[PDB]
Design a protein around this ligand. Structure first.
Ligand SMILES: CCc1nc(N)nc(N)c1-c1ccc(NCc2cc(F)cc(F)c2)cc1
Length: 329
């Protein structure tokens, strides 16, 4: 089963799932960086403007809904949502599973007013599930219908299909060459060891090694503030409140950036990481890379998000506890 994804500005990739009976539609990001499922709730006060601008789950319109009520707070690197737990049937690309999910009643305008998606479907491990709720993928695995204990991500470059997630395998039409796998530094987190990061001809970063969280829910590639400051000075990039920019006319000639993963160098060109919207020396162009200090136990760690995934098709293998990469097509 595959879910078609929409690509919003190269920063938000989301697909649709249906919840309840009849099905209530929601746009959601499939996030390997988290393990809970949640969507805005009809019980979310309208004083939360984000709830006025998104699809709301209304339990009182679903006959398959099962009440629970346990409070839960989900905090991401760029924001937090709070609400309570509920159960209902969820449809994900043809597959139907009874799932426990969060009904969000507190959804801060910043950043959710800037969210094209409604909610999130965590593709992480139960170990990181808040409230210890069984993740949706584990519930699908329990059904014994998927040919493989794996799911795959394809994120296209902007245009005008925005992307695609395959549950139970990979789609050969979206990658070439063969996968190369890196075992997880531990079960319960889609994090792998990274042997180094090079900018131009000089492995000036992550010498001695570091961690790499492969996060489908992260828009960019991130590193600790320290690491990023060093990466950016090398790029001649200037820091702003939320990001790093470079004079657009300089964009095209910025050096490659490679990530040493499992004995293979994964390289991105400036075209892969700079939002080239002009060539004017008078304008600033943002880079799809920035600081993000991920707290323990996960971090300190780098995060390989959409910027990385656009170039490398990614397969998350639950059975063998590893991640595989292949050149996206
Ligand atoms: C999909 C869930 C999620 N997963 C991970 N692993 N990291 C995140 N930062 C988020 C996450 C992403 C976007 C948002 N809000 C949307 C947004 C954020 C922003 F930082 C700037 C914007 F313009 C719009 C909230 C949480």
């Amino acid at each position: 089963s595959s879910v078609i994804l929409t690509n919003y500005m190269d920063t938000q990739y989301y697909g649709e799932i249906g919840i309840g009976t009849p099905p209530q539609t929601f746009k959601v990001v499939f996030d390997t960086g988290s393990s809970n499922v949640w969507v805005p709730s009809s019980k979310c006060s309208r004083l939360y403007t984000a709830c006025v601008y998104h699809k709301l789950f209304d339990a009182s319109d679903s006959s398959s809904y099962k009440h629970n009520g346990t409070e839960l707070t989900l905090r991401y690197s760029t924001g937090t949502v709070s609400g309570f737990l509920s159960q209902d049937i969820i449809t994900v690309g043809g597959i139907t599973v009874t799932q426990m999910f969060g009904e969000v009643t507190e959804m801060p305008a910043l950043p959710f007013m800037l969210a094209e998606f409604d909610g999130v479907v965590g593709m992480g491990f139960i170990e990181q599930a808040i409230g210890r709720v069984t993740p949706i993928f584990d519930n699908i695995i329990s059904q014994g219908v998927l040919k493989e204990d794996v799911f795959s991500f394809y994120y296209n470059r902007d245009s005008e299909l925005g992307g695609q997630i395959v549950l139970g395998g990979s789609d050969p039409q979206h990658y070439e060459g063969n996968f190369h796998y890196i075992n997880l530094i531990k079960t319960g987190v889609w994090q792998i060891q990274m042997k180094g990061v090079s900018v131009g001809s000089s492995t000036l970063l992550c010498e001695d090694g570091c961690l790499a969280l492969v996060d489908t829910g992260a828009s960019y590639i991130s590193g600790s503030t320290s690491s990023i400051e060093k990466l950016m000075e090398a790029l001649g990039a200037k820091k702003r409140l939320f990001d790093y920019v470079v004079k657009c006319n300089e964009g095209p000639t910025l050096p490659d950036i490679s990530f040493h993963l499992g004995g293979k160098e994964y390289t991105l060109t400036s075209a892969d990481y700079v939002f080239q919207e002009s060539y004017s020396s008078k304008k600033l162009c943002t880079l799809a890379i920035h600081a993000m200090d991920i707290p323990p136990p996960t971090g300190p760690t780098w995060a390989l998000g959409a910027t990385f995934i656009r170039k490398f098709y990614t397969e998350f293998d639950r059975r063998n506890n590893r991640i595989g990469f292949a050149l996206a097509r």
